[PDB]
């Protein structure tokens, strides 16, 4: 298994998949949750657009690299009428400054 965070705007999906499963199959997972078909989805590893036919392993999502405790991020962009929106992921909030004693 590979452990993933699928992220778009302010949405984050925690899910797992086989290293051997494909990008398309992951889109089918996204479609079940977020109700948008595969051809209205683009998935990314960082800035790299992921091809439907590649397995997750071939995209660089390995069980060593995508653990339950430290899932790998897949970016997600939807169709926006006649095009695709730009890939955009809202950062999580910033932690406060450490107390002094935690030096």
């Amino acid at each position: 298994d590979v452990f993933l965070m699928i992220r778009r705007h302010k949405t984050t999906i925690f899910t797992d998949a086989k290293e051997s499963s494909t990008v398309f199959e992951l889109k089918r997972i996204v479609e079940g949750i977020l109700k948008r078909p595969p051809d209205e989805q683009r998935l990314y590893k960082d800035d790299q657009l992921l091809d439907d036919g590649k397995t997750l392993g071939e995209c660089g999502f390995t069980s060593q690299t995508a653990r339950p405790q430290a899932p790998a991020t897949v970016g997600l962009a939807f169709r926006a009428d006649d095009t695709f929106e730009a890939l955009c992921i809202e950062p999580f909030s910033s932690p406060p400054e450490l107390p002094d004693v935690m030096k």
Partner: protein, 80 residues
């Protein structure tokens, strides 16, 4: 199958219902809004859920010192 957990800052985390039930609080209470738990904390909570379910050789669960105090309070609140 899935539940939505919303942080104070409005980030929406979609996690397997089974995983979310790791929290006794969540188990007790489709969406849950956490008005007092920000996304840098809630995100790590969700990773904890995955880790706990998967490990129920258990690996280390690393926590940045910078989130540790808030995470402790959240974990205590969530009963996990």
């Amino acid at each position: 199958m899935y539940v939505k957990l919303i942080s104070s800052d409005g980030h929406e985390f979609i996690v397997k219902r089974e995983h979310a039930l790791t929290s006794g609080t969540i188990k007790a209470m489709n969406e849950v809004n956490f008005r007092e738990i920000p996304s840098h904390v809630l995100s790590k909570v969700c990773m904890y859920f995955t880790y706990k379910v998967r490990y129920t050789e258990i690996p280390e669960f690393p926590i940045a010192p910078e989130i540790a105090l808030e995470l402790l309070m959240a974990a205590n609140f969530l009963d996990c």
